[PDB]
A paper describes a structure:
[name] is the primary component of the cytoplasmic inclusions in ~97% of ALS and ~45% of FTLD (that is, FTLD-[name]) cases. Full-length [name] (FL [name]) consists of 414 amino acids with two RNA recognition motifs (RRM1 (105–169) and RRM2 (193–253)) flanked by an N-terminal domain (NTD (1–80)) and C-terminal domain (CTD (277–414)). The folded domains of RRMs bind specifically to the UG-repeats of RNA and the TG-repeats of DNA and play an important role in [name] function in transcription regulation. We show that [name] filaments contain a β-sheet-rich helical amyloid core that is fully buried by the flanking structured domains of the protein.
Based on the abundance of peptides with respect to the spectral counts containing at least two repeats, we identified that the 82 amino acids containing core peptide (CP) regions between 279 and 360 likely formed the amyloid core of [name]. Under the same in vitro aggregation conditions used for the FL [name], CP formed ThT-positive β-sheet-rich fibrils of different morphologies. Consistent with the negative-stain EM data, the cryo-EM analysis showed polymorphic CP fibrils exhibiting variable length as well as a tendency to undergo lateral associations. A combination of three-dimensional (3D) classification and structural refinement revealed two populations of ~70-Å CP fibrils. The first CP fibril population was reconstructed to 4.1-Å resolution and was composed of a single CP protofilament with stacked subunits along the fibril axis with a helical rise of 4.86 Å and a helical twist of −3.12°. The second CP fibril population was reconstructed to 3.7-Å resolution and revealed two protofilaments, which were non-identical with stacked subunits along the fibril axis with a helical rise of 4.83 Å and a helical twist of −3.09°. The atomic model was built from residues Gly281 to Gly351 into the most resolved density corresponding to the CP fibrils of one protofilament. The density of the second protofilament was mostly disordered, with disconnected loops, and was not used for model building. One cross-sectional layer of the atomic model revealed a novel ‘H-fold’ conformation of the CP filaments that consists of six linked β-strands with rigid loops and turns. Despite their similar sequence, the recombinant peptide 279–360 exhibited a very distinct fold with major differences in secondary structures (β-strands, turns and loops), in comparison with the core amyloid structure of brain-derived [name] filaments or [name] fibrils produced in vitro from the entire CTD domain or shorter CTD-derived peptide fragments.
Residue numbers in the entry:
A (entry chain B), B (entry chain A), C (entry chain C), D (entry chain D), E (entry chain E): 281 to 351
């Protein structure tokens, strides 16, 4: 319906195999035989994130605003 | 319906195998034979996150606002 | 209905196997044979989180506000 | 419907195999026999993220705003 | 419908094999026998991200705004 978000993320309907395998949004995982130094950032400063919708990996949202801020 | 969010996250309807396997949003896991240094940040400063909707991994939301702030 | 959020998180309807396996939003886990240094932060400062909806991993929410703050 | 977002992410409907395999948006994972130094950033400064929708990996969103800020 | 975004991400409907394999938007992963130094950035300064929609890897969004800011 209105403001509708329907994310399937079907991935492995049948199946999933393999020594290293992964479905969906992935920011690492599975098997690691060494260093894993993964630091993602999404920071806000001053008049940040106004009237926005931050998604780094696959998001789903619906939004509605009418509002005047001040500082 | 209105402001509707329906996330399936179907992933492995049939099945999931493998030495290293993972479904959905993943920020690490499974098997680790070494260092795991993973620090994600999402920080807010000053007039931050106004009229927004932060999702780093796959979110679902519905929102409605009319409001004037001050500082 | 109105302001509706219906997250399936179906994951392994059939089954899930494997030496390292995990479904849903994952921020680590399973098997760890070494260091695990994972520090995610989501901090608010000053006029932070106004009129927002923070989700880092896959959220579900519905919201409605009309309100003028001051400081 | 209106403001509709329907992400299939079908991936492996039949199946997925192989020594190193992965479906969906991927920011690393699977198998790692060495260093893994992956730091993605998406930062906001000053009048940042106004009237926008940040997605680095495949997002889904719907948005509606009418609001005059100040600083 | 209106403001509609329907990303299939069909990927391997039949199957996916091979020693190194990956579907969807990929920013690394699979198998790594050495150094992995991958740092992508998307930063905002001054009057940044106004009236925009940042996607580095394949996004999906719908947007509607009428709002005059100031500083």
């Amino acid at each position: 319906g209105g403001f509708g978000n329907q994310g399937g993320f079907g991935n492995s309907r049948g199946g999933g195999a393999g020594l290293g395998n992964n479905q969906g949004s992935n920011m690492g995982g599975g098997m690691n035989f060494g260093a894993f130094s993964i630091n993602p950032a999404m920071m806000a400063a001053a008049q940040a994130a106004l009237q926005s919708s931050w998604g780094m990996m696959g998001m789903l949202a619906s939004q509605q605003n009418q509002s005047g801020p001040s500082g």
